[PDB]
Design a protein around this ligand. Structure first.
Ligand SMILES: *[C@@H]1O[C@H](CO)[C@@H](O[C@@H]2O[C@H](CO)[C@@H](O)[C@H](O)[C@H]2NC(C)=O)[C@H](O)[C@H]1NC(C)=O
Ligand SMILES: *[C@@H]1O[C@H](CO)[C@@H](O[C@@H]2O[C@H](CO)[C@@H](O)[C@H](O)[C@H]2NC(C)=O)[C@H](O)[C@H]1NC(C)=O
Ligand code: NAG
Lengths: 57, 50
């Protein structure tokens, strides 16, 4: 939604463009669009959902 | 100067004109072809119209 995905070599974060500030990737930082068969350079990872833990417990 | 992949640069640029950046990535090949054709047309236009 705002910022870009970066990686410190092992983990992926989403940070604002003009100033490093890594954050855990979640549904509050990313919006879904399309599928994985069209984008070029799309990588694989896991996006932690804030809602899942609340309902699981 | 900070490096950045050209594709992500155009994603920022599209964001700058109120278009969701997913539009660029889903249509990257079309945009590239249109841009190349535009450059070719410019080359043709300059070489003929003084
Ligand atoms: C990339 O950043 C992550 C996040 O800090 C690093 O993983 C953490 O490393 C610290 C040790 O410095 C641990 O205390 C944390 O528990 C780790 N996080 C998780 C979720 O396990 C990771 O090591 C960094 N990678 C590099 C190459 O620097
Ligand atoms: C990212 O993950 C997907 C699966 O979520 C991978 O897709 C696999 O692609 C290979 C090559 O065609 C297939 O044989 C597998 O069956 C696919 N997986 C599934 C679950 O269908 C994809 O290759 C991964 N890419 C990267 C860069 O990690
Ligand atoms: C990036 O460039 C490398 C070569 O340096 C190539 O192997 C890879 O497929 C390219 N990926 C993208 C998304 O352009």
């Amino acid at each position: 939604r705002e910022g870009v995905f970066v990686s410190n070599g092992t983990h992926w974060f989403v940070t604002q463009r003009n100033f490093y500030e890594p954050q855990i990737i979640t549904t509050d930082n990313t919006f879904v669009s399309g599928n994985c068969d069209v984008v070029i350079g799309i990588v694989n990872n896991t996006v932690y959902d804030p809602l899942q833990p609340e309902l699981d417990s | 100067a900070l490096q950045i992949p050209f594709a992500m640069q155009m994603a920022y640029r599209f964001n700058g004109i109120g278009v969701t950046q997913n539009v660029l990535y889903e249509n990257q090949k079309l945009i590239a072809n249109q841009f190349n054709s535009a450059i070719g047309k410019i080359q043709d236009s300059l070489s003929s119209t003084a």
